[PDB]
Design a protein around this ligand. Structure first.
Ligand SMILES: CC(C)=CCC/C(C)=C\CC/C(C)=C/CSP(=O)(O)OP(=O)(O)O
Ligand SMILES: CC(C)=CCC/C(C)=C\CC/C(C)=C/CSP(=O)(O)OP(=O)(O)O
Ligand SMILES: C=C(C)CCOP(=O)(O)OP(=O)(O)O
Ligand SMILES: C=C(C)CCOP(=O)(O)OP(=O)(O)O
Ligand SMILES: [Mg+2]
Ligand SMILES: [Mg+2]
Lengths: 327, 201, 327, 201
């Protein structure tokens, strides 16, 4: 019962890996680990065994990722919506998480060996207090570790994460750390649970569903989406390989669209700021332009004072986030 | 009177499905230099004919938003052909929205600015912004979320289409909107009608 | 009595010319032909002979210019202020101009040989009617000629030229051809008497005076200024050479300053236009920026409609300028 | 009381010249990264001490205009040293103007816009704008034109300094304003005093 198998790639897996690694490779892949219960019914086994096998496949898939040089992975492990399942199944999932997390602690120091950082993202106050303590110990121990990153989304939905990010920024203006005008797409990005990682290059959902089910909606707006029919506990290296092949095919147009979005956003921001500086210069009676370069220094100070407030807000938010007596 | 028969047939087609989308998004991932408004307009007219209440047209470059008049002109053209201009014009503007990237993340940021402004005016509390209140605050208002998106073209991405609203949208991909046929459009509807939505249960 | 001697450069003149022509050469030189009367007193000859010798030096200096590949020359020949001199001297200058101009007409067709375009700039309505007719015939005949350009500034001051340019633009708005907002530095430039030539690369004044005496004040704002002590009728090839040497030494910093001025002007114009588009967008209730790229097309149409009005105004002004029954 | 003697000596120096400029321009053609406000301020103080009414400081890059406070601070510093702050401050702002390129051609264009606006309001005629009326219209107003310009540095150009106003300005060139001495400044004044102005006659 461990978080990552230790197997090396076979000849054909290794060969195909070398080939695609000549092209652009994803740095961060997100997985919606869907189909555990259908898998259990197909193999005529209990639902708890389908979920346990699902965890085993997660451990195996992380080893594939590491063997492919993909060093950050985010997985959907428990939705807030999944609290609506039967107590029998929910208790089974909570028990599984309790047994995998503690076991991570027994298997600790081996996490120090491979530099594995474990983060658990979601509205964790809805979990059993004992499970929160096991989870809290997890992030505490594996913080400051560098070689790879696993983000487990537990008691998570995207709407709840986006709502919390807005609440965080609202808390900022309530504390005098932020002006409501400082709120921006970049700032909301830095208030998500995922704020320590780049947006996923690939979002993979198994079992043939073509929906996102409230997962990383903000972060995957420009991610390559891969919907594969295989049920999660039957995921293979070749399913993962196919998803990466999809990513390489999309990469040129996708990075262009990503850059064009960013260039348009930064630009529309410049025009809003120039317009605001103009409004302050329409008032006070000064000129719209002149050799004195007045609007230029007003623009410089507007953004610098904005960046100062933002940097100060993020540090207080990070300190509040690291303020935990829960571990 | 032959237009009444065509309306009857399309109504029967929509009614025959196990379920119909209330709000469909059309995401064009590749718009050509001369945009194919006639193909988009036909998709929109088919949606309205089969009984879909709302249609959102979307491209990442904002071409349809910057050509909104030409698009509605072509929609109204094909709405009369093979199917009181003011009522027809008003009904298309109620049912059809032309969207661009700023309707997604930028609008969520707009809502966050508005709400934080109330916090700064001591009129609301940070804890007052829950999931349901934020949804009310977006410029989607009472409009239902998209339940089906038809994604056209070679890009395997939603490209910034209403991220908040597509938490449960079914995303059906077709290769091209160009010379799109009613049978191909309706086959996409059959796929959505047969999908199983469990809502976490 | 002709407008340009035919002598070729001597060995040393020719050699030094080849050397400097390896570097940047002026395309247009302006001359303030000062010192004629002091020269006459120094040689114990009548003032009329000093001015006649001054004309001879002009003819010789133009040949030097042509031999140096400098194909446009502007000269200060008569100031409006010079009407305040004695009738004896003024009559002498008017007589000289009458005799040189007609003689240009007798020596015509030889102007067709060397493609010489003659322009006479100033408030010419102050001249004797006969002299206006001789002058009017001059520009009429030598229009459409290409190989070189001589601009004679007669009954001219810069303030009177700038005032006339403003009156021309004011006439434009009176006729519905211009909006008062269309008035710009570039438009005023295109209403000067000199509007068919580039600004002078060099402004030369002889006799040791270090003032401009109301000559080409707008056009020489960024020109290399050369004040030489020699009296005009004693001007030599080497005085001209020294002035060009001055120009080559200044050229790097001067063209940088010229370009920086132009970059700052075009830029301040962009900011005024963006501010105006913003004001129209603050009103009407529309946004300062958006995916619709509204301010971009408003900016495009603002300038294009401005350029259309300007192009239409200039054509009517040119037609009014070519509307002459004075020749 | 030794400051009264210094004021007396500088007054005698200015009075001793055949003529003194009423309005001097200081055109700096090369401003260094750290501008030498102390050298400029000394030039300004010497002008005011010898009896020159107006001083215009100019550079093509607008550095002195964008550092106007530091410049006046240094002028007031040296005005007290070796020579009621509000009266001293007011008198320097009346006598000293800091100019940039926009005070030349751009201001003439401003005046042309203002006058053509009156033409468009049927309030003035195109023939109403003569030489004298345009001069009144510029933002120079009743201030006299510069009669002497001290041009410092290696550029043989006025670099856009008040083109309308320098129709008869004597332009005296010195190599550098850096560590400029009173003797060098006064020798420039002697040159201007000895110049002969004929006004076209
Ligand atoms: C993080 C950790 C240590 C453990 C939790 C992760 C594991 C092992 C399983 C995820 C639980 C769920 C609900 C997976 C979705 S498949 P489904 O249940 O929706 O099956 P279905 O789609 O109905 O076939
Ligand atoms: C265009 C043409 C055909 C003829 C006119 C051009 C000629 C020959 C002479 C220019 C007349 C004047 C006033 C020259 C200025 S020198 P000055 O008189 O000011 O002498 P000074 O400075 O007092 O020594
Ligand atoms: C932990 C996970 C993968 C939750 C999302 O899968 P769901 O099964 O709950 O999503 P739906 O098909 O019910 O929408
Ligand atoms: C035709 C010319 C060269 C007029 C300018 O010279 P002036 O002699 O008239 O100028 P001032 O010295 O009198 O100012
Ligand atoms: Mg499922
Ligand atoms: Mg003279």
């Amino acid at each position: 019962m461990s978080w990552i198998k230790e197997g090396e790639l076979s000849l054909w897996e290794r060969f195909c890996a070398n080939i695609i690694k000549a092209g652009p490779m994803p740095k961060h892949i997100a997985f919606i680990m869907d189909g555990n219960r259908r898998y259990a019914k197909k193999c005529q086994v209990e639902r708890q065994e389908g979920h346990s096998q699902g965890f085993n496949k997660l451990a195996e898939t992380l080893r594939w990722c590491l063997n492919l040089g993909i060093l950050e992975v985010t997985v959907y492990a428990f939705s807030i919506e999944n609290f609506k399942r039967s107590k029998s199944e929910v208790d089974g999932l909570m028990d599984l998480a309790r047994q995998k997390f503690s076991r991570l602690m027994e298997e600790k120091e081996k996490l120090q060996k491979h530099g594995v950082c474990i983060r658990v993202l979601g509205d964790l106050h809805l979990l059993p207090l004992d499970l929160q303590e096991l989870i809290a110990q997890a992030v505490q121990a594996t913080k400051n570790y560098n070689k790879c990153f696993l983000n487990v989304c537990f008691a998570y939905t995207s709407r709840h994460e986006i709502s919390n990010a807005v609440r965080e920024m609202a808390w900022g203006v309530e504390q005098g750390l932020l002006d409501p005008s400082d709120i921006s797409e970049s700032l909301l990005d830095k208030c998500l649970y995922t704020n320590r990682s780049p947006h996923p290059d690939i979002l993979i959902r198994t079992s043939g569903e073509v929906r996102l089910s409230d997962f990383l909606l903000w972060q995957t707006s420009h991610s390559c989406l891969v919907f594969q029919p295989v049920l999660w506990p039957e995921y293979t290296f070749w399913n993962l390989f196919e998803a990466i092949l999809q990513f390489q095919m999309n990469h040129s147009v996708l990075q262009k669209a990503r850059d064009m979005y960013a260039e348009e956003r930064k630009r529309q921001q410049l025009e809003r700021d120039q317009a605001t500086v103009t409004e302050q210069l329409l008032r006070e009676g000064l000129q719209a332009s002149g050799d004195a370069q007045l609007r230029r220094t007003r623009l410089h100070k507007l953004s610098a004072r904005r960046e100062e407030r933002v940097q100060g807000f993020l540090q207080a938010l990070e300190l509040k986030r690291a303020d935990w007596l829960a571990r | 009177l032959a237009a009444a028969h065509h309306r009857m047939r399309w109504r029967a087609d929509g009614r025959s499905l196990e379920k119909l989308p209330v709000h469909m998004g059309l995401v064009i991932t590749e718009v050509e230099q001369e945009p194919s408004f006639s193909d988009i307009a036909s998709l929109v007219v088919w949606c309205m004919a089969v009984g879909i209440s709302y249609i959102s047209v979307y491209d990442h470059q904002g071409i349809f938003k910057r050509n909104n008049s030409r698009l509605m002109d072509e929609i109204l053209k094909q709405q009369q052909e093979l199917l009181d201009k003011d009522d027809q014009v008003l009904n298309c503007h109620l049912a059809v929205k032309v969207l661009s990237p700023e309707d997604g993340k930028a609008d969520i940021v707009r809502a966050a600015q508005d709400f934080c402004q109330l916090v700064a005016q001591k009129q609301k509390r940070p804890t007052d912004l829950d999931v349901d209140t934020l949804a009310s605050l977006l410029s989607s208002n009472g409009c239902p979320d998209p339940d089906l998106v038809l994604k056209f073209g070679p890009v395997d991405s939603t490209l910034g289409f209403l991220p908040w609203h597509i938490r449960l949208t079914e995303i059906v991909s077709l290769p091209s909107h160009l010379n799109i046929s009613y049978e191909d459009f309706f086959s996409a509807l059959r796929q959505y009608a047969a999908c199983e939505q469990r809502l976490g249960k």
